[PDB]
Design a protein around this nucleic acid. Structure first.
Lengths: 661, 86, 521
RNA sequence: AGUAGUAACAAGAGGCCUCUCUGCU
């Protein structure tokens, strides 16, 4: 009897058992080597979809630029970047004239948040390309080194405190004829020795003061670090992600805030919604669209994906968008909200590490860096890399970075592209034909419902939506999109069938020891299970199994198994002695060898408070000792605040609140 | 990785940072063949290190402290427990 | 003066703003006046009217005939059978069993107590070479087996292994290339860039079917015992405790949970040794603890392993693990499954009165820190199972108004045992129970862990859309497709040499044949 | 060899020699 797992779908609907088509128990794929090849491929693909546009040379940096906007129309189903300007202006005008007062309200909210926030908002994010040392850094140290190097060239806006003088310093540093900065350099200092040579060439760290020119500061300011996307599930081949510097974060923050203020009052946007509100969003959208169908007419639904989505959107189209949106606003905010498209239309990709050339017979290897990429003849690379380099060559600058005008290259404007998608969805009709479309748009994903008299008119409306999105640079994947009747679709990997919503493609996290200390990890783990059960919709028996898996990992990591168990060790000897000496055994903590009591209803309670009225008086005297020698000096981070990589747990400072060296 | 770091730290003999006082003098240097803490001096702060078996030694045979009025401090979670128990 | 904010641009950012306009404009002020002043109404219709008709979706209606079978090159009998490339043995393992009282102990001690009971296999010194790999060295591999079986059985506490010539051969010492300066690399003409080795193209082997058959069934021992929770008070805890106590009662005695715990404990001790001793070769035994239905604890010894030099700085540096595992499966019965292994015949056992031959499978293998770190967390193969179980229960709770766990498991005068389609004996369908379906789901999660790399990720993500299209055809939603050859060609570049992906393609073809055959009725 | 999969690891840095305890009822 040959067991077949797919036969499960004969007696169960496929949406109810779709979680077996998520292989989330295996290893997510990592990327050993360089992401120089993938970055070169992304540069070539970006410049390939827009090669029929206007090509020129920048008179600021000297890079070869390419402009595809208001270019020729496509003639094939290949991807395009040629977004017509009047079509985007008409989509935004219809979006404004259907929701009156929306744009002025969003612009006023964005300015009245700009006149409030401070520069510490530029630390609550991700890694940051550092122009000082040409590497990724955290956001706090990148902002700190940028401020302390701006102080040398008399740029004292950040000493005031706000965001507007700091961005004034950013756009005024581009006019300095020379920029000086603090670069950490291990420049050698010679030391004597007693050996045959008598010198030890070592690398003593210090801080030197180096300076570059104005063009080099501009090219480091417009730069864009690139790497490979690690641990990304769902694709076979890897890809490159970008990371922008600190000269651009303050403008991207305001443009994202403006587009979020637009998207919050949009009735066809599935971002930034979250929780069970998303299942309500799918059900409300299907109910509103079935509450509008003609009698005797068919309502279809296209479940769709966007191919090359962040490679075909232009920053000039985003410049035109933020020029249209902030229209009845003052001039300085109209110039402020038009600087992030300027810095994204002149961006320069950094090419990564290089390529490793080997010699197999002599068994040697070396790494060709990015400047010397064209310093060897091209017949010493393999065929894929050789075609890559032949196609890259007109865009390579001699510092090892390649020019990249079009495309969004990872997605920093994840809300303005959503606004563009909703602007495309709001057209609803072309040429007074008998259909109407609506639907949802989540950054890269989308779902389009079409009501019409029959299904031929539905397919004609779908074709008009495809040809209309060609005019905006919105490319719809014809290999990853299908279309069926209403009542069976998918959006952001939430599946919908017959009113039932299956919420998945959330991998269950590592239910294991975070590593802070004993009481901290117990509180963090139980809060992880409670937050998963509230937000992600984790079931009851699944959460009890998650409690048990966390308890097993917790007892392994801290060597604190139950006192009536046969586990042995250096700690379990004294733990079993404590279990022998204790009268009331249910008051002992988990980490002292006692039992577990956590169930679904008391995950919010600390362990010490949960077990306090059951402890022996001796055990709570030694446990809650005032001058216990394990805690040390107090601070807020050792009490409540710690990250999950943020939460706030409740740790009573007893003798399980130690810290390492 | 902090999970593996906490795993390999608890495998090690002396991963903790025992502060000074008389209470760190109450804890012995070994106990029934288990070396609880070491006995050394540091470069800048002059300290020692100890095992987690020493923490369980404190919880089993340590000195009784004063807890006449602990429940007045953390009464938020005790109100949570009072709501839970009935 | 007026209290207005000031933000006045320089010269360089004004020039960068001037050269950032679309085609047809000169500076920024002309574009801004164009957007402010003029009216754009009615341009989308003209732009659609002058665009070519070759830009379309070309939509086609889906039938049951347009669904060809995915991956047609796995039936091609000139490709090699896909080999066995898992880390440890799964359905062919043989634990030397030694009954204890249940106390934990050091692995070296466990192996020493397991080999002293089975002292006829430890004292074997003359091998009988059954199978040899292509590039293996059977003399060196046999000397490494003797070196491990003597170092685990001496009278000390150390399991360190001396770097002899065979341990340096097997652990791959002295094979890295020396880095040279880039000037000598540029000036030399014989230094090219290596062409990548793409994965192969193998056909369906029959051993994956027997792995799915045997790891679903019930054994007599259980190696899974999760810790406790508190009492149950609220009714959600009652429903959850009922579903837990039925799921674990069905999953406990399956072979897959034994294999899962073997993987967990082995990857734990391997990661501990790789971080603790980077410079030594250390002997690491493959062990487990198992319990029958009377409460008697057994220690099972499954084999021994040699860890190389683990100076793993980055997260993808490879450490070399050489594995010697006991078995009873004759490696000449299914010869196309074991080209990666060197098999000796090292003795005999009595299972219940009859002699079983005992073979030793030896293999050079490797791993990085990410796979060892995800190895200790293979108990997540319970969670994704249990969660999936509830998605089958609550749909039944779309029928009535109580917890239908007992109804799906046993039923009453109202309900019945919900028989599931479980598999295909002799061509006809075969119906199993809910526990058998739960064990098939648990083995599917486990084989996603064991046989999982980027090919499984890509194949799952590209065939899920095909499964949703087949669900749309079953419901008569009447799906329309735009480019089906693209979906199929995105699927069929993921089937190279993963055994689970090839068997998933075969099983998909079989189930699609059943669905087409049942559509005509 | 092997792992792995479009590209890396199979030690590195220095003057023959140094530096980077582990028990899953």
């Amino acid at each position: 009897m040959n067991i077949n797992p797919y036969f499960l779908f004969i007696d169960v609907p496929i949406q109810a058992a779709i979680s077996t088509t998520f292989p989330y128990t295996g290893v997510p794929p990592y990327s050993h080597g360089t992401g120089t090849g993938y970055t070169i491929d992304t540069v070539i693909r970006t410049h390939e979809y827009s090669n029929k546009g206007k090509q020129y040379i920048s008179d600021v940096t000297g890079c070869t630029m390419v402009d595809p906007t208001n270019g020729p129309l496509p003639e094939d189903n290949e991807p395009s970047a040629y977004a017509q300007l009047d079509c985007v202006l008409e989509a935004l005008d219809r979006m404004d004239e259907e929701h009156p007062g929306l744009f002025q309200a969003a612009s006023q909210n964005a300015m009245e948040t700009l006149m409030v926030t401070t520069v510490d908002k530029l630390t609550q994010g991700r890694q940051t390309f550092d122009w000082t040392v040409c590497r990724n850094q955290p956001a706090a140290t990148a902002l700190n080194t940028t401020i302390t190097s701006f102080r040398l060239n008399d740029l004292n806006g950040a000493d005031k405190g706000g965001l507007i003088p700091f961005c004034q310093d950013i756009i005024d540093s581009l006019d300095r004829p020379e920029m000086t900065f603090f670069s950490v350099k291990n420049i050698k200092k010679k030391l004597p020795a007693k050996n045959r040579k008598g010198f030890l060439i070592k690398r003593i760290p210090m801080k030197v003061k180096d300076k570059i020119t104005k063009v080099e500061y501009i090219k480091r300011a417009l730069s864009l670090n690139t790497m490979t996307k690690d641990a990304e599930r769902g694709k076979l081949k890897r890809r490159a992600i970008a990371t922008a510097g600190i000269q651009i974060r303050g403008f991207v923050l305001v443009v994202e805030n403006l587009a979020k203020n637009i998207c919050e009052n949009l009735e066809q946007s599935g971002l930034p919604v979250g929780g069970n509100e998303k299942k309500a969003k799918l059900s409300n959208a299907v109910a509103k669209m079935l509450s509008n169908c003609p009698p005797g007419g068919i309502s279809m639904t296209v479940t769709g994906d966007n191919t090359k989505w962040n490679e075909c959107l232009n920053p000039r189209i985003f410049l035109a968008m933020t020029e249209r949106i902030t229209r009845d606003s003052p001039i300085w905010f109209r110039d402020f909200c038009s600087i992030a498209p300027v810095l994204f239309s002149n961006k320069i990709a950094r090419l990564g590490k290089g390529f490793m050339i080997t010699s197999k017979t002599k068994r040697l290897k070396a790494q060709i860096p990015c400047p010397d990429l064209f310093s060897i003849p091209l017949e010493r690379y393999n065929e894929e890399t050789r075609a890559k380099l032949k196609k890259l060559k007109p865009f390579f600058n001699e510092e090892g970075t390649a020019s990249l005008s079009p495309g969004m290259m990872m997605g920093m404007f994840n809300m303005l592209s959503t606004v563009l998608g909703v602007a495309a969805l709001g057209i609803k009709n072309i040429g007074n034909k008998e259909y109407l479309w609506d639907g949802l748009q989540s950054s890269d994903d989308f779902a389009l419902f079409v009501n019409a008299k029959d299904e031929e008119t539905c397919m004609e409306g779908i074709n008009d939506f495809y040809r209309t999105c060609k005019l905006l640079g919105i490319n719809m994947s014809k290999k990853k999109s299908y279309c069926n009747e209403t009542g069976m679709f998918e959006f952001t990997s939430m599946f919908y069938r017959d009113g039932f919503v299956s919420n998945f493609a959330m991998e269950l996290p590592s239910f294991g020891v975070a590593g802070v200390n004993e009481s901290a990890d117990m509180a963090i783990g139980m809060t992880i299970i409670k937050n998963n059960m509230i937000n992600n919709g984790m079931g009851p028996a699944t959460a009890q199994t998650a409690i048990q898996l966390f308890i097993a990992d917790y007892r392994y990591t801290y060597k604190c198994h139950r006192g009536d168990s046969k586990v042995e060790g250096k700690r379990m000897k004294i733990i079993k002695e404590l279990w022998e000496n204790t009268k009331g055994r249910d008051g002992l903590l988990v980490a002292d060898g006692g039992p577990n009591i956590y169930n679904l209803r008391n995950l919010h309670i600390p362990e010490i408070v949960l077990k306090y009225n059951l402890m022996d008086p001796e055990y709570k005297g030694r446990l809650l000792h005032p001058q216990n020698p394990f805690v040390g000096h107090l601070s807020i981070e050792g009490i409540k605040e710690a990250d999950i990589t943020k939460m706030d747990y409740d740790a009573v400072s007893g003798t399980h609140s130690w810290r390492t060296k | 990785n902090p999970s593996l770091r906490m795993k390999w730290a608890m495998c090690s003999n002396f991963p903790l940072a025992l502060t000074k006082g008389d209470m760190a003098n109450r804890i012995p240097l070994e106990y029934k063949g288990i070396q609880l803490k070491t006995n050394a001096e540091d470069i800048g702060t002059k300290g020692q290190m100890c095992s987690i078996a020493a923490v369980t030694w404190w919880n089993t045979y340590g000195p009784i402290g004063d807890t006449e009025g602990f429940e007045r401090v953390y009464e938020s979670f005790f109100l949570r427990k009072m709501r839970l128990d009935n | 003066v007026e209290k207005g904010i000031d933000f006045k641009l320089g010269q360089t950012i004004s020039r960068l703003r001037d050269i950032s306009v679309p085609a047809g404009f000169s500076n920024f002020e002309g574009m801004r006046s164009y957007i402010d002043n003029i009216d754009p109404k009615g341009a989308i219709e003209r732009n659609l009217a002058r665009m070519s008709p070759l830009v379309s979706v070309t939509p086609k209606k889906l039938t049951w005939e347009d669904l060809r079978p995915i991956g047609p090159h796995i039936y091609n009998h000139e490709l090699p059978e896909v080999p066995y490339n898992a880390f440890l043995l799964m359905s062919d393992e043989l634990g030397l069993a030694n009954m204890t009282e249940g106390k934990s102990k050091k692995p070296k001690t466990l192996a020493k107590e397991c080999l002293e009971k089975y002292s006829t296999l430890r004292d074997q010194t003359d091998p009988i070479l059954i199978m040899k790999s292509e590039k293996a060295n059977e003399n060196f591999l046999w000397k490494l087996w003797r070196d491990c079986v003597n170092t685990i059985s001496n009278e000390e506490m150390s399991n360190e292994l001396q770097k002899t010539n065979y341990a340096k051969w097997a652990t791959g010492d002295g094979l890295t290339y020396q880095k040279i300066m880039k000037e000598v690399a540029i000036d030399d003409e014989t230094m090219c860039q290596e062409e990548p080795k793409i994965p192969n193209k193998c056909r369906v082997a029959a051993w994956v079917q027997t792995e799915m058959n045997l790891l679903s069934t019930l054994t007599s021992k259980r190696a899974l015992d999760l810790p406790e929770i508190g009492p149950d008070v609220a009714p959600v805890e009652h429903v959850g405790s009922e579903r837990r106590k039925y799921f674990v009662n069905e999953i406990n005695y399956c072979k897959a949970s034994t294999v899962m715990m073997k993987y967990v404990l082995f990857h734990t001790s391997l990661l501990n040794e790789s971080n603790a001793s980077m410079g030594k070769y250390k002997v690491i035994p493959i062990t487990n603890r198992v319990v029958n239905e009377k409460g008697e604890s057994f220690d099972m010894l499954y084999g021994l392993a040699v860890k190389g030099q683990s100076h793993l700085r980055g997260d993808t540096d490879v450490v070399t693990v050489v594995t010697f595992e006991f078995s009873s499966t004759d490696p000449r019965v299914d010869s196309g499954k074991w080209p990666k292994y060197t098999v000796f015949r090292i003795g005999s056992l009595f299972v219940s009165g009859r002699e079983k031959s005992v073979y030793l499978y030896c293999r050079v293998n490797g791993t990085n820190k990410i796979q060892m770190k995800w190895g200790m967390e293979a108990r997540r193969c319970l969670l994704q199972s249990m969660q999936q179980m509830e998605a089958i229960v609550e749909q039944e709770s779309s029928i009535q108004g109580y917890d239908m766990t007992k109804a799906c498991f046993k039923g009453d005068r109202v309900n019945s045992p919900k028989t599931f389609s479980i598999g295909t004996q002799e061509g006809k369908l075969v119906k199993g129970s809910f526990g058998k379906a739960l064990r098939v789901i648990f083995t599917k999660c486990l084989m996603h862990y064991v046989f999982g790399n980027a090919q499984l990720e890509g194949f799952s993500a590209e065939s899920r859309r095909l499964l949703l299209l087949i669900q749309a055809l079953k419901d008569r939603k009447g799906p329309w497709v735009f480019d089906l050859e693209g979906m199929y060609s995105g699927i069929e570049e993921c089937i190279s040499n993963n055994p689970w992906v090839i068997q998933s393609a075969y099983w998909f073809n079989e189930w699609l044949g059943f669905e087409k055959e049942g559509s005509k009725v």
